[PDB]
């Protein structure tokens, strides 16, 4: 995802 | 008016706005007074950039006369939240909120152009009404001032006491003075 | 327009002044307050042993102006009998209750309103703190004087002034804000 | 309107002027200050040995106007007894403390505020420097006079005037702005 | 409101009463109406007694130059020596009138502040008309500087250099600059 | 406020009017002009043999108002001595030069400005032509009168009035606009 | 500002003193209030002396017609002959009142001016109401033209042709037009 | 309204606004008062051009009555930072900030048209408040004035003292006067006569 | 609103705004008051047309009441700087700045419509300030007036003295009068 | 808002605004007060239409309360210059400039709707300034009035003297009255 | 904002704004005050529709508070000119000019919704100036009133005298009353 | 169609 | 065509 | 072209 | 890239 709670690579 | 640019990729040509093209290169612009709408926009850009590549540094150009504090805190909190190092650059001037966001950049990645200026001062505000309401709002802004000074001291390395003495009134600083004051890290005179 | 009377070439307000009667009408500002102060001093110089009458119909105003009137009333020797007509606001009520003990009156259909001071300032946080502390001291001082003139407790006044509180003539009497009511001249004959 | 007193017809202010009472009200300005100056000169002409009384209730104003009143009070032979009603601002406080030694009084609920001058100029940097130096000299001159009348050190005045400082009647006495507090006419 | 005084007994206003003592006030910006009023007062005093000196108290931020010239011309024109006193401040046209007083009768209170600067003006229109108005104001500036040098005793060159920009002067500085004669600290003292 | 004098009670301007002195200050409008006209008539009725004095300090104004004053000055018998203080504009200059021959004076640092009339109109082309011709006739009439009083040729006046022309006291004398200068009262 | 005069001791303003000499001033735009004032003066003068002529000086740019008609009707109602004089200028209503003066007692100063034009009016509303107001103003125009022709002696047709648009006239032209009688060059001459 | 132009390319016809098409030719316009928004746009354009070709010269046309200083310093710093030589051209007029940018252009690549006018003056400013704050702001503007004069002297070659004397009041200069003063190098009377580009 | 037109080409149909379609034919419209922004736009168009085909002529239609001088000089200098001959046409009216640009066109390529009207007058300027500053600005506007008159005399071919006498006040000229004066070479009564 | 319409062509469907679709059919709309910008737009459309087909008649629809003259003269001259016959039609109303343009249409091709109203009046203007300046402007506007009357007489066939008497004040004319006057050749009561 | 809709066609899906989609179905909207610009737009739509199919009836929906008369006469003449029967429908309200256009529709094709209200009144106007000018304008507006009343009488079928008596002042008509007054033909309550 | 008068099933 | 003068089917 | 100076058939 | 930090060919 893109938000705060979202996880990223 | 905003000029349109062309990007020549293997996939094909693409028409972009000058600001949008720079965003593709991890460059954000913080121009004008700091309000809620522009700040919200900047927050969205940071999040979008983080997701694309959370390891590449983000760049934030700052030319601003300052503004609301709440808006600035959102940008500041977002910068400290994301993993990428937000390299702040000062172009033209940084105001109290702009300076706060400038010094909030990643350690060693806070730059200032030679002829740029920086201004730090204590928060501004006011209220009209009953004495009870006045006391509440007064206490709140004082807490804000204390919180801002603590953050400035943490980033600048200075002592909280020194920051309070220097922020009691508008203090101007050039690029060299800012470097010595710990507000920035270096200067960009020419390209190497 | 202001009528004129001959007794010679007196306006209606001056003729009443000859009878030791002052009017406190409209918002309390510095100029009108200074005018009232001048009248009290003039009356005192003319006869410092006769009572003065101050009729109050006002929606309130600046506090500094009110304090000048209050300090002047408590400074001069004559007893300043305060009377409430139509309404007494926060500053009006403060001046009303500040009258001579036993000479504070209110007409039956009048109304009194007491609240805490109003103010504000815009500027640096430092300047805000100064002005904030100042208005609080003013609020404290006003409450102390109100409690002294009303007989009530400082705590009760602080609780009742936190928000606009309205009181009729009877309520004000029970609240110690006034002394009695003036239904008719011949039925009371206080004067 | 202003009430009229028959004694010949006198406005209430004129009757008090007969008793050497002058009222300073509202923001200070050239026109109001000029009127006060005229009253002082007229009273001095009428009697140069009787004391004058100046009641002060104002939020302050122009400094040039205030200086004319100050210079006039210190120039005329009579002693000008200053009294504070409601409030005295920076210029009002300056005039208040400028009264004759031992004849400066404050009412118990009056509030006194002292602050440094306020000024602004728009123009070229050269002109800005000129006006800046001028207002600074004015600030220094005002502080010197304040220290002289109050009796406080010049350095102390600078620290207390850097920002708005409020003082009640008792605090003013300790500071030295006013000699004493008037509670009752018979008592004092 | 203007207070009143009683002086048989005759009603008077504060300013009019002082006028009996040959005292005039030049307060506020210098315009045409107030200037005409001052001019009228001088003429009236001259008719009453053309041998007694007049006193003109000056507290003004300046104004129109034409109005000031009328006052200056009138003071020179009449026989009485017009003693100019400065209270508060004297601006470009206030200072010009102040220094225009009778030699030895130009005073300034201790905390007064004088300001001298070159004239101000402007015009909007064709280039031809601009040249005319520009030349006129320059002649006015030259004329004002000449008179200031004559009254202050200074040189024309020095005045031109000191009037190019706003120059402030306290009471002592004005005395050394020849703009005034002395200071009035106390009536008894002087 | 205007000061009053006792001679029972007189205004400062009224007192001078007793000495045959009129003031023409500010822009020339119909009301002030009517007032000046009234003063002239009043003075004429009192003594039609004593010269009147008219002091002029004005930036100009309406022409109709000025012409009423001019026609009145020439109508009455008393010689109206015009004096210029501070400045005389186009209408002020016209009234100044309209004074009695040998009684038009100017102060040393006074100034004079002469220019052709100003006007305007908005509407149909027909109405424009009418109003245009009128103002031109007015311009011609004013120039003729200026030439008569000054003594300059009509052509010279037209060339000098095409644009604003400024003149000092000496230049005005040489230009015939006035007669002499009053450095001091005793000398003249 | 209006100066006082003296004539025991009595306080008179300049206009009242002239009124004592049977002189009225009609200055500024013609409205209802100023007109009512002029009417009051005429009646007061008539009561004092209904046989002495009144003088009315006119310097006006015109105004309401109803107001002017009250003045006109009043002048023709009272017995005294109202001699009208023109100073500066007379507009449509001013000219109407000027020519309305007593025959042989209508004067103009040498450099005065006169302007005659047809009435000006406007109405916004329903077409029905418009027709009413339009007819009324036309009747007024006819009535005004008839009176002008009666006082000036000209023909009604000539007046209509000349009033169709603003027509300016000098003192001599006005005389030849019958609008006035003569010109007051100097008091002594006439 | 802004006209749109068509550029012929191998891929096909492409549509651009007139200003964008010129940008493709390394041409920037600095028109109107200098503010923060327009300055950032110019700064963005310079950076974009540098990346495309850091060796080709940039052209900046100047027709401006001046404006904020900070906004102008950003443009100045950006020009002195990038590698390309920013050839400044004056069209119509260059005010104090416009002239400063014009002289800031690469040595030998500063031009003015024959009828263009250049005005230089000391900074303008002001503040309202306490005496303390006035001293702070007054000191700051003076430092700005000093810094600006130093830069002008460096680019024009004149002495700092001469610049201070000439900037004390509004000084106007034509194209020839400017060339002798060092503000510019030559005059673009005709495109092919000189062929500077 | 601006209408959109369609251009027929072999490759494909294209949509253009009416003004851009004419620009494609080397036609530039000067309308309204002369300001800096519109002037910049006109200047940009000339540079683009020059790059496309320097040899071909550029047409400039003038319908302008007047405007700033600095803006006009930029247009004038640009026309005299580029290679293409700028044929000026007057539609409706050409005022002092418009007339200056009109007469500045290429010799023999300056035209006016029969009913168009041309006005010329000296510059208009104002300044408020100190007498010293007033003198500086007054000299500057006079030099501008002299420079403008010199250029007007060169293009028109009239003597400098005559131009000064005629520009002291507003002078109106019809299409024929302009031809004799030399502002415009000829008139376009009808297409031939 | 402006609706968008679809045109069926051999190449494919095309999207056009209602105003542009009619321009394709050689219809130009003159609406609102005349001014430089709208007049310039009309001029551009006429030139474009002439190039497409200089033989097909152009149609101009006029509903205007009138306006500037210079702006109108440009349109008038442009119409009389181009080869195509500019058929003018009056819808709603034609004011002084609208009427002048309406009667400037090709002979036999000037139409009016039955309920349309036409008003003709003399020019309006004004100037404030010195008497010398006023004389110049007054003469100029009078020449304009004379020039306008001459053209009106040429198109309507009426004598110049008659036009002057009728234009001294606002004169209203209906479609039938206009025909007898000669402003318009005929009326479009119904389609045939 | 205006929503966009999709139309499924043989060629493919097409994106249309809601108003354009209804125009494709021969539906025009006459909303808001009547004026030259809106009336001109309505006129263009009618002409476009007539060319598309001159045999299919056009539908005009009226929710107007009224407006200019001239702008309305253009629409009226356009409706009475073209061949298609312009079916008018009243939604919300029809004012003096809305009602005039409503009753101007094709006989038997003038509908009104049940709760819609119709108001008819005499023209409004005014003028400020000389008496002569007032007479001209006053006469003109009266002729307009007469012309409007004649047209209303013809379409409604009422006598001219009755119309004059009922238009002297504002008269409000409900949908049932309008049918009896001849302003409309029927009422649309539900879909059959 | 889509209008009021238009028919729909 | 589409205008008034234009003819239609 | 399309302008005035431009020639057409 | 395009910024100040970004390197250029």
Numbering used by the authors:
A (entry chain B), L (entry chain D), M (entry chain E), N (entry chain F), O (entry chain A): 267 to 275
B (entry chain H), I (entry chain M), J (entry chain L), K (entry chain K): 2 to 193
C (entry chain n): 2 to 8, 15 to 198
D (entry chain h), F (entry chain j): 2 to 8, 15 to 195
E (entry chain i), G (entry chain k): 2 to 8, 13 to 195
H (entry chain N): 2 to 198
What does the literature reporting this entry say, word for word?
ClpXP and related AAA+ proteases maintain cellular health by degrading incomplete, damaged, or unneeded proteins in a process that must be specific to avoid destruction of essential intracellular proteins. Escherichia coli ClpXP, for example, degrades proteins bearing a C-terminal degron called the ssrA tag that is added during tmRNA-rescue of stalled ribosomes. The ssrA tag initially binds in the axial channel of the hexameric AAA+ ClpX ring, where the pore-1, pore-2, and RKH loops contribute to recognition. Subsequent mechanical reactions requiring ATP hydrolysis unfold adjacent regions of native protein structure and then translocate the denatured polypeptide through the channel and into the degradation chamber of the double-ring ClpP14 peptidase for proteolysis.
For cryo-EM, we used an ssrA-tagged green fluorescent protein substrate (GFP-g3yg9senyalaa; ssrA residues underlined), a single-chain E. coli ClpX∆N pseudohexamer, and E. coli ClpP. Classification and three-dimensional reconstruction of EM images containing one ClpX∆N pseudohexamer and one ClpP tetradecamer generated density maps of ClpX bound to one heptameric ring of ClpP14 and 7–10 residues of the ssrA degron in two distinct conformations at resolutions of 3.1–3.2 Å. As seen in previous high-resolution cryo-EM structures, subunits of the ClpX∆N hexamer formed a shallow spiral (labeled ABCDEF from the top to the bottom of the spiral in the clockwise direction), which docked asymmetrically with a flat ClpP7 ring. The pore of the cis ClpP ring contacting ClpX was open, as expected, but the pore of the trans ClpP ring was closed in both new structures.
